[PDB]
Design an enzyme around this catalytic site. Structure first.
Site, PDB file in Angstrom:
ATOM      1  N   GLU A 102     -34.628  -2.345 -12.525  1.00 62.72           N
ATOM      2  CA  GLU A 102     -34.570  -3.817 -12.717  1.00 62.72           C
ATOM      3  C   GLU A 102     -34.447  -4.309 -14.169  1.00 62.72           C
ATOM      4  O   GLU A 102     -35.296  -5.065 -14.656  1.00 62.72           O
ATOM      5  CB  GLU A 102     -35.727  -4.507 -11.997  1.00 62.72           C
ATOM      6  CG  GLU A 102     -35.738  -4.179 -10.511  1.00 62.72           C
ATOM      7  CD  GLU A 102     -36.809  -4.867  -9.774  1.00 62.72           C
ATOM      8  OE1 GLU A 102     -37.624  -5.582 -10.418  1.00 62.72           O
ATOM      9  OE2 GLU A 102     -36.855  -4.693  -8.537  1.00 62.72           O
TER      10      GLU A 102
HETATM   11 CL   LIG Z   1     -32.174  -6.288 -12.495  1.00 66.59          CL
END
Ligand SMILES: [Cl-]
Ligand SMILES: [Ca+2]
Length: 512
Positions: free
Chosen positions: A180
């Protein structure tokens, strides 16, 4: 109600990847085929000493969390990569054919276990070791814990030294390019205070993927591990997105196109799997379906429908995605079009997802449906992420419904075939054949209706002659998979099966 199901074992055939039935968190009693070590704790994990930092999930705390979570014995606390070797050792002991492990790209990894860090401890500082991708000196199986740096090539090299290449029986098959990245500044402000640039993610993914290929040419790379639709779209309002957008519909196109260009330049595929996280934004009864609250019936209903946003162009979900980014749904056909237009041959991975209500029939049906979807629509890899402190008995039922429905590790087929239901709102139906066992067909059938039973009228078009059917399932009365009544009678590959409300079933048809 009556629902027709038309199966053709000679139409719309699709190889089901075995690695869709994976997890990030072990189950007390559920069959898995893939495991990931990844997520927020990966970014600042230090392979030299096993220290890591929670980031904003837990007070920017630097600690031994990954040592305890992965059950590393105290005498390996200071053994390099002991967290990852405990992890992959367990994969091997379990007979799990694919381990996905995460490498660091955020920029820095925990130097200590000093607990909650102050805002003043922002990297660079004595609290952090610098990540470098390439050591540019000789690699060691005993890395130096006393200098200011940690090396990703040296890390992969340690793992391959232990297990061998991904091409062999024991090798770690997959490497995640961190986790992420567009959330680095809000998840990991102390590592990466600034917004992540589109150009930065591309560059770091590219260089980290080159390290993997150098050390293990046969290992697969997973990137960028995007958190959700907002990152798919404009890389979470990336400051450089406007200037690199050009004609690209979304960041996924930019990313695929450039990894393709970067791979062509390097002379080899640098991206094996476009890796994505998908926590549904779908709402019902004014609640996001990811909730643990199963008293909300409209939320429960939305939950079982929510997997339709992955594949069904006729389905509209209640979310900001459903409202504002209709162009990006259904998700898998959209992503698949991007792959086919920008980087053909790239695989699709969902390394985190969770449909909520894990200890409820609606959570089991939604999980069973998601597993059917991944298999029907060409997902290569998927790993569930636990969101309810292991109160996940119906999630476990869904996994067992596929690959251990009878408690004897009998499993679903490896080839998806045409299986069209006349009611996609009230039912989901998947059929599979097994490439080296023609005697059998496997069918997943679920009744998503909250109150009504369904009479399923099955029409199997096949050159096989199926003469008997056995049935296993779970429902709102128990997560335990019970053997249900056999298929009554099969005549000319046609039969009926009545399924009560909120029931998921695996049907096994046999010629003999
Ligand atoms: Cl991301
Ligand atoms: Ca070092």
């Amino acid at each position: 109600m009556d629902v027709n199901v038309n199966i053709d074992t000679n139409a719309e055939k699709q190889a089901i990847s075995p690695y869709i039935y994976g997890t990030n968190q072990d189950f007390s009693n559920a069959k898995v085929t893939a495991r990931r070590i990844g997520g927020n704790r990966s970014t600042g994990y230090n392979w030299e000493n096993n220290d890591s930092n929670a980031g904003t999930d837990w007070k920017n705390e630097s600690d031994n969390y990954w040592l305890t979570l992965y059950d590393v014995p105290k005498e390996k606390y200071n053994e390099p990569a002991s967290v990852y070797t405990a992890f992959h050792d367990k994969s091997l002991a379990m007979g799990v054919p694919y381990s996905l492990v995460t490498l660091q790209a955020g920029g820095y990894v925990a130097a200590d276990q000093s607990g909650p860090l102050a805002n003043t401890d922002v990297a660079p500082s004595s609290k952090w070791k610098k990540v470098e991708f390439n050591k540019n000196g000789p690699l060691s199986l005993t890395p130096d814990t006393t200098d200011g740096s940690v090396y990703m090539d040296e890390f992969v090299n340690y793992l391959v030294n232990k297990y061998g290449s991904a091409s062999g029986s024991k090798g770690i098959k997959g490497y995640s390019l961190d986790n992420e990245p567009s959330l680095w500044p809000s998840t990991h402000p102390l590592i990466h205070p600034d917004k992540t640039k589109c150009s930065e993610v591309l560059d770091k993914d590219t260089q980290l993927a080159q390290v993997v290929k150098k050390i293990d040419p046969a290992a697969e790379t997973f990137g960028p591990a995007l958190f959700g639709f907002s990152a798919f779209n404009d890389f979470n309002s990336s400051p450089d997105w406007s200037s690199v957008k050009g004609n690209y519909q979304w960041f996924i196109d930019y990313y695929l196109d450039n990894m393709k260009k970067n791979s062509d330049a390097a002379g080899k595929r640098l991206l094996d799997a476009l890796d994505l996280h998908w926590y549904p934004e779908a709402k019902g009864g004014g609640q996001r379906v990811t909730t643990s609250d199963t008293s909300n019936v409209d939320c429960n209903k939305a939950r079982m429908q929510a997997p339709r946003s992955l594949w069904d162009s006729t389905y509209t979900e209640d979310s900001w995605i459903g409202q504002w980014c209709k162009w990006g749904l259904p998700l898998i056909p959209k992503v698949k079009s991007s792959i086919d237009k920008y980087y053909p041959g790239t695989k699709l991975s969902f390394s985190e997802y969770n449909y909520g209500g894990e200890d409820h029939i609606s959570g089991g049906i939604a999980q069973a449906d998601a597993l059917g979807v991944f298999g029907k629509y060409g997902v290569y890899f998927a790993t569930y992420w636990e969101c309810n402190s292991d109160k996940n008995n119906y999630v476990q039922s869904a996994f067992n419904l596929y690959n251990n429905y009878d408690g004897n590790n009998s499993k679903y087929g490896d080839t998806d075939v045409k299986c069209d239901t006349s009611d996609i709102n009230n039912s989901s139906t998947y059929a599979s054949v097994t490439s080296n066992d023609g005697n059998k067909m496997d069918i997943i059938v679920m009744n998503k209706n909250y109150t009504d039973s369904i009479n399923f009228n099955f029409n199997v078009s096949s050159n096989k002659n199926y003469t008997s059917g056995q049935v296993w399932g779970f429902d709102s009365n128990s997560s335990n998979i019970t053997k249900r009544d056999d298929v009554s009678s099969i005549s000319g590959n046609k039969f009926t099966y009545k399924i009560p409300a909120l029931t998921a079933v695996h049907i096994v048809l046999l010629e003999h």
